[PDB]
Symmetry: C2
Subunit: 94 residues, 2 copies
């Protein structure tokens, strides 16, 4: 869970309601997954962890709601989010 | 001003108080500059423009306050912000 946040590639956030930390390990797995996600209190924790460890936080309200509504922690991201997350990962990971 | 926002490389935001759109034209100028910046309603406008045009919005509270406190529109960014902005530009621009 939130112990894994320092290893997140990015966090997708909706201020100040939602945060979704994304994991990506292209050396091993073809797809990104959700490390941890939450709303309110828990979102604030995830945000605070990311800031501490220098993990990039992207504002994307529709994507954050979508990850929250359809995804699950420790599960590869929903198909409906795949391309938008990939855009983020494309530059972040270069 | 806010007409130039579609050409921004990134927006630095503090929810939901501050937005700073950053311009970068490494083909011509050595340094990034501030395209447009504001707080409250003006921040909301800048954010809305960026979302519409697919400009990446990064949540960085200290940097946003710093750009706001020391920078000016149509001026190369303050020295105190140069390295943090460069980190953002480094991946965004790859
Ligand atoms: Cl939660
Ligand atoms: Cl879950
Ligand atoms: Cl303003
Ligand atoms: Na957004
Ligand atoms: Na050019
Ligand atoms: Na921040």
């Amino acid at each position: 869970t939130s112990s894994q946040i320092k290893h997140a590639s990015a966090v997708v956030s909706a201020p100040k309601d939602i945060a979704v930390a994304i994991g990506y390990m292209p050396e091993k797995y073809k797809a990104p997954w959700i490390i941890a996600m939450g709303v309110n209190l828990r979102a604030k924790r995830i945000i605070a962890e990311a800031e501490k460890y220098g993990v990039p936080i992207m504002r994307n309200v529709p994507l954050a709601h979508q990850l929250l509504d359809e995804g699950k922690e420790l599960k590869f991201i929903p198909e409906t989010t795949y391309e938008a997350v990939g855009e983020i990962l494309l530059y972040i990971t270069s």
